[PDB]
A paper describes a structure:
We also present structures of [name], in isolation (2.4 Å resolution), in complex with avenolide (2.0 Å resolution), and bound to a synthetic DNA oligonucleotide (3.09 Å resolution) derived from its natural binding site. The overall structure is reminiscent of that of other TetR-family transcriptional repressors, and consists of an obligate homodimer. Each monomer is entirely helical and consists of a DNA-binding domain (DBD; composed of α helices 1–4), and a ligand-binding domain (LBD; consisting of α helices 5–13). The dimer interface is formed via interactions between the two LBDs and is formed mainly through hydrophobic packing interactions.
In order to gain further insights into the mechanism of hormone-mediated de-repression, we also determined the structure of [name] bound to a synthetic oligonucleotide derived from the autoregulator responsive element (ARE) sequence. DNase foot-printing analysis had previously established the identity of the ARE located upstream of the aco gene, but this response element is pseudopalindromic. Crystallization efforts with the symmetric [name] homodimer yielded crystals that did not diffract beyond 8 Å, presumably as a result of the asymmetry of the ARE operator. Efforts using an artificial palindromic sequence derived by inverting and repeating each half of the pseudo palindrome yielded crystals that diffracted to 3.09 Å resolution, and the structure was determined by molecular replacement. As a result of the use of this symmetric DNA, each homodimer in the crystallographic asymmetric unit is bound to a monomer from an adjacent ARE. The structure shows that each DBD interacts with one half of the palindrome of the DNA duplex. Numerous contacts are formed between helix α1 of the DBD and the duplex, including Arg5, which inserts into the major groove and interacts with Thy7, as well as between Lys43 and Ade15 of the ARE. Additional non-specific interactions include those between Thr10, Thr42, and Tyr47 and the backbone phosphate of the duplex. A comparison of the ligand-binding sites with that in the hormone-bound structure reveals that the binding pocket is further occluded through movements of Trp127 and the loop harboring Gln64, consistent with the roles of these residues in effecting conformational movements of the DBD upon binding of the hormone.
Residue numbers in the entry:
A (entry chain D), D (entry chain D): 6 to 218
B (entry chain H), C (entry chain H): 9 to 218
E (entry chain E), G (entry chain E): 7 to 218
F (entry chain A), H (entry chain A): 4 to 218
DNA sequence: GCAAGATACGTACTAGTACGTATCTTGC
DNA sequence: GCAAGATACGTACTAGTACGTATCTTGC
């Protein structure tokens, strides 16, 4: 068990380094200094900065805390989005998801062998799973393209987050994520599921409080 | 005036290829073919260059054919921009300018990524108010938050497009984004009038090249 | 590809200002802002530069809006070209290219002034045959001699315009030249259809800038 | 009288130099060597290369031999044009008119103080005089712009000549000058004066023969 | 684990060499690019020379092949046409691009790289294929497989050089297909020649199958 | 002052070539070229302004002042002779140092630092090879609609590689054999009937053409 | 005849100086430009210095004036606004442009040009005008014509310098009119101030009349 | 390694300025700057890459590190003090060698050879002068719709000339008198009532401001 | 407190230029 | 045959670079 704890001490250190200076500018020593583990300690778990970065990308979907199982399936999606918004904002929520976001958004190069496809594909299928469930519980309009909507939400979320970083340091992210869902859902969500959805910041906070405890 | 454009174009292409922090003046010099001396007249630092390319995407990006249906103009703008980003030598400025704005970097690099975004946002809002007054969108829609939503929404659709299929699907992805965002604020029987078609998309590309 | 255009433009402006024989590579370097090295990739001699700018006035000069009345197209071409020559930064290539062709120099400078003229002549002839087949000019008109007459006629009208009122009157002088040459070969009731007006002249200027 | 002959020996030498290398490239020594006169011989008549060039421009209208006084005034214009065409072609006709043409067509610079306006203004008024006479002898249509036609002919002649130099070394100039007049005259010349005009090369040669003798 | 870190370094080395060439490259460049530790590097490779020699020793060894073919000459043709795609784009295989630069660049005898070793292996690999095709009855009776193998290896490398110089490798596929189209009439059995597929559209299909 | 200008210019060119061939473009210095040429600094800088200019000028001398082959009966033999002659010229410890330097300058890569035009010697090579094939087409020794342009790109292309591989394997020792191989295998795909057996691929001939063209 | 050849040389000298400045200029440049003989040149001027000094000694002397005015301050204003046009275009007067460069450029005391001489004359010329306007009752009682003349000469030269640097003399006319608009309220009699015409359209009309 | 970098950089800048002021841009050499600065070649080239870069950097130091005037009661007096202070600074056998070099570099012309940006020091001069006038407008010491921008171009413009003429006539000896003249005559055209008599145009003050700002 | 690195300064070259002298060309 | 000039070569610098060592910074 002393191996699985020290690997996470490495991964968080790498992600922390990657968040602040990007994949390019970061060195293996940067990650080594932050983690405060030995050269050989590192070498057991990760062979290279690439292998490090790929792993922090790989644990982006599994990293996000899952909310208590909601009765309305679209509300789960709404709550998850506003949780992720609160997680990125205050920071102290999660350290991996920040650097893993920056690793995915950063353009980089084909010469660096990062696979930004993995955290983005797996994120889309997860969003598709919820929308596929919500359809089985009859929450979405009869002829909606569940696949195109997953891609759209996964896209739009990334960019609403990008803008919110630039303009306000993510201070308004809650309001903007809420805005995205408040405007996107009238197109595919059943009317009446629309009146039943809880957009308020007061509710979304009471999910951030509950996820920690 | 002549060399500054040649420099800025070359700067954008280098910034697109390696990103701000990896890039050097040296690389921009070599890619521009201007003399050492010709560059320093205009730009002393790499920081000065990047800032200049960012403030350039305002007036470098080609304007759209004016229309009475202001939402179709807004739809054209984003579809044109979807093709500009796809190209390579369609516009070298926008591609580098995007990568400069989207990429995070550091506060240590003093680049103001806010002002291209400030411009992008103010422009889409100005067009939506010109759609509001002409009775195209619901009477009391939050125009400021909508434009902020459109800028943000596009940015991510673009990023997601870039990673997944080297920007190739961006035309369709922006079409979906506009189709799905519109019913939340468009007035009745306006969505049906709007032209989302790919063969119109490549047709507005011709009228912009001046 | 990028620098070659920047070089050629700068070469044309220097050639316009001082003429071929007075000009040096040194002057073109300084006016272009490209490195010594960047120029030699493309051009070893001053002769090589001039020849390149001459062969450029073929494809650099912007094309005219296609019309069913082929003589109106021919009239537009020469009126557009009358405004291109008047400017300064409208097109720097044509102005230098003209001065290079018109000026006499020497046989010692190996410049082939024939091939821009060969191009200019063949182009106006090709348009006149497209007017002949569409029944716009008298059935058996000497098309080869007419185009040669039009190229020659323009060249002098231009020179005379340049000397007398710094090219300012060229629009009117080319209008007169077309008005007076037309009845000798135009079919009945075609001269009356043709639009010579100055406010059309400035209007075709917009559609050419691409 | 030994002064007026030696001044023309200078002027022809200058014009000859100016024809072959233009105003710019030519030196005062170039003119001095060709003329074979002394430094002081030159200085009496001309102070500078500019003063030289201006003088050769100034004697362009007076230089052209005037044809025997024709009955048809437009035929005089036609014959004069085809004479000038023959004069430039064979060369041996006149040495001044070649260099004086090149001095006028060459763009030069505002920094050189040549006045290319003089040979061109005086050439236009002369063409206007003929067209003004032809009107008094009723050879031109009732509402023709005599001033615009002088400018047009003076222009078009310069450029028909320019093209003919580039393409054929002026070999076809006769045919091209003829062509210009054959196409320009239907617009302003009276019909019937048009049938009375002699365009043939055989006639125009018999003016070149006669002008020498 | 150790083959993992070796590969990471080799790929980075191959990139730097393809970028700046042997002389201009530093070991310092290769370190920053691999993203391994100083210690990790100096265990597998001591000097710049050893790095270069290793990438060279992997040219044939790490070249992605094809689906096994009925015609071993079409196997040969598809491999070559694949290499033309594998050399052009920003994504190919860095090992190939790297060693191709290392082999073709002259340098000097002052540097101690063995350029003959990748060349020998690539010639032998080509020969082996032509030998395999002789027993399967594809090539004609009195053919010199050695001399033909040397021809192909040589011809390809220069077809590839001209292409880089003139079109930045753009026309490489058309140049290679051209090469194989004129050379094979000399040694292929007629009946193989008409059953051969040089087509550009087939070249895309072998490239799409190479996403594996 | 023409004659002596040509003489010193050639000393510089031969010296530059030798330097380029032994260290390449980037490693070479003007310093190196001065030492070997024997010329003064101002003498060289009168003729060539930069290392690039020097290097370009040797690539120019690959085209011009390349030993002329005799006017042959068959245009293809004239092409075969030209290829095997160059093979001899790249081989020997002198032959031409200019052809050796040029090939190295053409085949090496160099950084995006340099502005050396490698397209130019290759274009002239291809245009000359095309011209020989087009003359062979009118004589009817090649197929009447064979792609004369695509073949020239093929020959220039392949030869360049045949040479490079030969340099690596045998220091260009076996070059002429390899070039003969190249031609023996490529010609049948576009040569007319009868024409192929008439050609003389022998090292017995390739050397007679060599010593004749040396004079 | 001799004043003819002197002028020809001086104008050419003034051009070269305006183009390359004093130090860069050669006498060789001035010869080729004047188009006179070596002998003709060396009779009037021996050295580059003597050439430069002569153009400088002609700054006021060869400056085209105006039609005589009712208001001597509007005479002053029109002259200054004329100079702004006479300095901008490719055609002005080369003597002005030349000497203005010669005066404003620093050089060194190592060269022996007297920059004070054109400056003295231009200051005296300005003073004389203001003195002429005092007796005609245009300027106010307790005004220092000397100090004002020095101000104007100084102010103009720098207004002219800034204009060259920022707009390549494009805005010089607007800058000079601006200068005269703010300075004159200090010394002009009110009643002259409202009768004064700074207008750009009038500036064109004085320039059109200067075609003589 | 910041502190010592600033120290050597300033030695180079002061030395460059001195050189530029005495021979101008074109005549000056890197050689000259090395000799006077005392610095090694590699030391200078670490900080400045070309003569242009040097010359630009001294024009940059005209703006920054120009002696600050005290926060005055009247914004126009603060402008009057700034002008007369610079007049003292251009005058004295030291004062600042940087302001002297900068002025010469700005006012000279140079060939189309050089790529020195003279617009930049002038723009900063004009923008600072405009800022002072705009603050004077809010305080209501100037006319409420006076063209604050056109005045800044006027002051920078005229001062530059007042100085140039002063250099020629009296080696800048009478500069402060001339500058006082300039201000006494220009201010009434845009100053509010009362404001003008409150201003202190005296050389009695201009020197008190000088020694205070020197410390 | 110190290992990594960033930064600052130093040395030894090579590249580039300005201007000087020599030597051929050429048009009478 | 030779004066003007164009051209070729020479000398003495200054500019620019590559790579070396020293010295500070900084994040644990």
């Amino acid at each position: 068990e002393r191996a699985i704890r020290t690997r996470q001490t490495i991964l968080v250190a790498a992600a922390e380094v990657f968040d602040e200076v990007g994949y390019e500018a970061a060195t293996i020593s940067d990650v080594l200094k932050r983690s405060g583990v030995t050269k050989g300690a590192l070498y057991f778990h990760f062979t290279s900065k690439q292998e490090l970065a790929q792993a922090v990308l790989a644990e982006q979907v599994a990293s996000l805390p899952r909310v208590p199982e909601q009765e309305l399936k679209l509300q789960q999606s709404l709550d998850e989005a506003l949780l992720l918004a609160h997680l990125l904002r205050e920071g102290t929520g999660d350290p991996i998801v920040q650097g893993s976001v920056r690793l995915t958004v950063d353009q980089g190069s084909p010469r660096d062998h990062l696979n930004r496809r993995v955290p983005m594909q797996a994120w889309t299928e997860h969003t598709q799973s919820l929308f596929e469930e919500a359809r089985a519980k009859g929450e979405i309009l009869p002829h909606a393209d569940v696949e195109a909507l997953a891609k759209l939400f996964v896209g739009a979320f990334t960019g609403v987050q990008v803008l919110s970083r630039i303009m306000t340091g993510r201070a308004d992210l809650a309001e903007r994520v809420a805005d995205l869902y408040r405007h996107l859902m009238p197109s595919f969500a059943m009317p009446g599921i629309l009146v039943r959805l809880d957009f308020s910041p007061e509710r979304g906070s009471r999910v951030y409080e509950a996820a920690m405890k």
